[PDB]
Design an enzyme around this catalytic site. Structure first.
Site, PDB file in Angstrom:
ATOM      1  N   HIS A  46     -19.306  13.726  35.241  1.00 16.29           N
ATOM      2  CA  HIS A  46     -17.903  13.254  35.208  1.00 16.29           C
ATOM      3  C   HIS A  46     -17.029  14.153  36.069  1.00 16.29           C
ATOM      4  O   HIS A  46     -15.971  13.719  36.470  1.00 16.29           O
ATOM      5  CB  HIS A  46     -17.383  13.142  33.772  1.00 16.29           C
ATOM      6  CG  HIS A  46     -16.657  14.329  33.243  1.00 16.29           C
ATOM      7  ND1 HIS A  46     -17.173  15.125  32.265  1.00 16.29           N
ATOM      8  CD2 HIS A  46     -15.456  14.843  33.535  1.00 16.29           C
ATOM      9  CE1 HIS A  46     -16.323  16.068  31.978  1.00 16.29           C
ATOM     10  NE2 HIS A  46     -15.283  15.925  32.740  1.00 16.29           N
ATOM     11  N   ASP A  97     -23.814  12.536  30.874  1.00 16.71           N
ATOM     12  CA  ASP A  97     -22.877  13.368  31.590  1.00 16.71           C
ATOM     13  C   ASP A  97     -23.602  14.643  32.030  1.00 16.71           C
ATOM     14  O   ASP A  97     -23.485  15.712  31.416  1.00 16.71           O
ATOM     15  CB  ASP A  97     -21.664  13.662  30.700  1.00 16.71           C
ATOM     16  CG  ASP A  97     -20.447  14.096  31.490  1.00 16.71           C
ATOM     17  OD1 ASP A  97     -20.433  13.858  32.711  1.00 16.71           O
ATOM     18  OD2 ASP A  97     -19.501  14.663  30.888  1.00 16.71           O
ATOM     19  N   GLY A 196     -11.215  21.676  31.895  1.00 14.11           N
ATOM     20  CA  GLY A 196     -11.515  22.712  32.876  1.00 14.11           C
ATOM     21  C   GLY A 196     -12.788  23.481  32.543  1.00 14.11           C
ATOM     22  O   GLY A 196     -13.346  24.165  33.395  1.00 14.11           O
ATOM     23  N   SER A 198     -15.384  21.703  31.331  1.00 16.93           N
ATOM     24  CA  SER A 198     -16.438  20.710  31.506  1.00 16.93           C
ATOM     25  C   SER A 198     -17.485  21.215  32.488  1.00 16.93           C
ATOM     26  O   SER A 198     -17.150  21.880  33.472  1.00 16.93           O
ATOM     27  CB  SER A 198     -15.874  19.373  32.023  1.00 16.93           C
ATOM     28  OG  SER A 198     -15.082  18.716  31.039  1.00 16.93           O
TER      29      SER A 198
HETATM   30  N1  LIG Z   1     -13.926  20.429  23.118  1.00 16.38           N
HETATM   31  C1  LIG Z   1     -12.787  19.742  23.117  1.00 16.38           C
HETATM   32  N2  LIG Z   1     -12.102  19.591  22.000  1.00 16.38           N
HETATM   33  N3  LIG Z   1     -12.350  19.190  24.244  1.00 16.38           N
HETATM   34  C2  LIG Z   1     -13.038  19.317  25.382  1.00 16.38           C
HETATM   35  O1  LIG Z   1     -14.095  19.906  25.497  1.00 16.38           O
HETATM   36  C3  LIG Z   1     -12.437  18.643  26.546  1.00 16.38           C
HETATM   37  N4  LIG Z   1     -11.145  18.334  26.386  1.00 16.38           N
HETATM   38  C4  LIG Z   1     -10.471  17.708  27.351  1.00 16.38           C
HETATM   39 CL1  LIG Z   1      -8.745  17.393  27.031  1.00 16.38          CL
HETATM   40  C5  LIG Z   1     -11.115  17.367  28.529  1.00 16.38           C
HETATM   41  N5  LIG Z   1     -10.486  16.683  29.591  1.00 16.38           N
HETATM   42  C6  LIG Z   1      -9.351  15.769  29.426  1.00 16.38           C
HETATM   43  C7  LIG Z   1      -9.724  14.450  30.096  1.00 16.38           C
HETATM   44  C8  LIG Z   1     -11.064  13.930  29.573  1.00 16.38           C
HETATM   45  C9  LIG Z   1     -12.301  14.789  29.889  1.00 16.38           C
HETATM   46  C10 LIG Z   1     -12.160  15.787  31.045  1.00 16.38           C
HETATM   47  C11 LIG Z   1     -11.043  16.826  30.918  1.00 16.38           C
HETATM   48  N6  LIG Z   1     -12.425  17.676  28.669  1.00 16.38           N
HETATM   49  C12 LIG Z   1     -13.112  18.310  27.709  1.00 16.38           C
HETATM   50  N7  LIG Z   1     -14.426  18.584  27.924  1.00 16.38           N
END
Ligand SMILES: NC(N)=NC(=O)c1nc(Cl)c(N2CCCCCC2)nc1N
Length: 246
Positions: A46, A97, A196, A198
């Protein structure tokens, strides 16, 4: 990373920082990753699904800081960007992913292990640790869901693996979490991954080994009660991984 502590690369020497160079000549951070062998970094599809030209990506290893050079870091081009053929995104979740970046220095080399660079082990297939196990996550992601900026210094924290049963309850994520995923959270909801982070590693001691057990994938908000972090479940993907790495 929400909560947790600042750290340096030496405490998570497998961590890879992946950026995108822009036509404006601007370079912005994209996602984290993990060095699983000398020429390979594993991350999350992603992260690159929107811009898939390998050419515009740079991977650093040995890097402790977001926008300044760390002594002993190495810079790499991406020779191959391999995104999962069955990736998809639902309302919250992402599926399959998982991505591989084959890295090559402009001088033609793969990573050279050091005080600040080491590979991490993969798990045996379908072999994960029990629910309630404490694992470590690491990244340059937001310190608050509501922040504009990422931190300049690398962070990490500890979360506990949650049961699928527990994760599949309606107040949590219900039907959107699958067996090809793992849930991890703080018992009190204090600390979490965020935007960030991810592509970054969820590391667990499995057997007597520090093993890469998950890849940061998604969650609602960050550090929200009954909304744990969701991670690609690496033990499910050994065939995919080995296919490309051989
Ligand atoms: N662990 C928790 N609670 N959250 C996360 O890990 C997490 N949270 C968010 Cl907001 C996020 N985003 C927001 C847009 C959708 C995905 C890409 C970037 N990615 C994640 N991976």
């Amino acid at each position: 990373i929400i909560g947790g502590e600042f750290t340096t690369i030496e405490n998570q020497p497998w961590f890879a920082a992946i950026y995108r160079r822009h036509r404006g000549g601007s370079v912005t951070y994209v996602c984290g990753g993990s060095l699983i062998s000398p020429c390979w970094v594993i991350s999350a599809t992603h992260c690159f699904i929107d811009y898939p030209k390998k050419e515009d990506y740079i991977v650093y290893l040995g890097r402790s800081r977001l926008n300044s050079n760390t002594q002993g870091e190495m810079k790499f081009e991406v020779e191959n960007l391999i995104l999962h053929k069955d990736y998809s995104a639902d309302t919250l979740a992402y599926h399959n992913d998982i991505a591989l970046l084959k890295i090559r220095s402009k001088e033609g080399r793969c990573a050279q292990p050091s005080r600040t660079i080491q590979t991490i082990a993969l798990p045996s297939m379908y072999n994960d640790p029990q629910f309630g196990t404490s694992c470590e996550i690491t990244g340059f992601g937001k310190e608050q869901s509501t922040d504009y900026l990422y931190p300049e210094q690398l962070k990490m924290t500890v979360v506990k693996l949650i049961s699928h049963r527990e994760c599949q309850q309606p107040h949590y994520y219900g039907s959107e979490v699958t067996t090809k995923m793992l849930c991890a959270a703080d018992p009190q909801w204090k600390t979490d991954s965020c935007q960030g982070d991810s592509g970054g590693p969820l590391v667990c001691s499995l057997q007597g080994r520090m093993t890469l057990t998950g890849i940061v994938s998604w969650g609602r908000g960050c550090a929200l009660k009954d909304k744990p972090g969701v991670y690609t479940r690496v033990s499910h993907f050994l065939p995919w991984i080995r296919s490309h790495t051989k």
